[PDB]
Write a protein that binds this ligand. Structure first.
Ligand SMILES: [Pb+2]
Length: 134
């Protein structure tokens, strides 16, 4: 009953913020971290997480590209969490068409404390994602 989450973000500060949000829940556990797309794919195969929070702009391989490889090699539920994934945005549409279940819009840039604003929403998305098969 413990949802296993893989947190992907090039910012260590955001990875920590997301860790605090997720690990504080009685029904969730962050099983691993990834700081770029390459690690995201590797950790997705290795850990076989139930849900993956996916940042987009990252060095070496972006989140969109990691998403495609994961959905082919080790398909699972992915929620895009980026400053770019806004409602109606082209990149949001692109993520969704490639297998992503949903998205969260980071308020105030790629890195910020204000992120806690969308914390309840993110937790809701993670729980809801378990109700669909990608
Ligand atoms: Pb980023």
């Amino acid at each position: 009953r413990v949802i296993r989450v893989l947190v992907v973000d090039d910012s260590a500060f955001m990875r920590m913020v997301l860790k605090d949000i997720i690990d504080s829940q009685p029904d969730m556990k962050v099983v691993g971290f990834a700081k770029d797309g390459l690690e995201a794919v590797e950790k997705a195969i290795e850990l076989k997480p139930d849900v993956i929070t996916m940042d987009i702009e990252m060095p070496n391989l972006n989140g969109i590209e990691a998403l495609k490889l994961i959905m082919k090699k080790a398909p699972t539920r992915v929620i895009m969490v980026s400053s770019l994934t806004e409602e109606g945005a082209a990149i949001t549409i692109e993520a969704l068409r490639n297998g992503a279940v949903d998205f969260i819009t980071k308020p105030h840039g790629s890195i910020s404390l204000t992120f806690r604003q969308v914390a309840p929403e993110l937790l809701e998305k993670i729980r809801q994602a378990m109700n669909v098969d990608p």
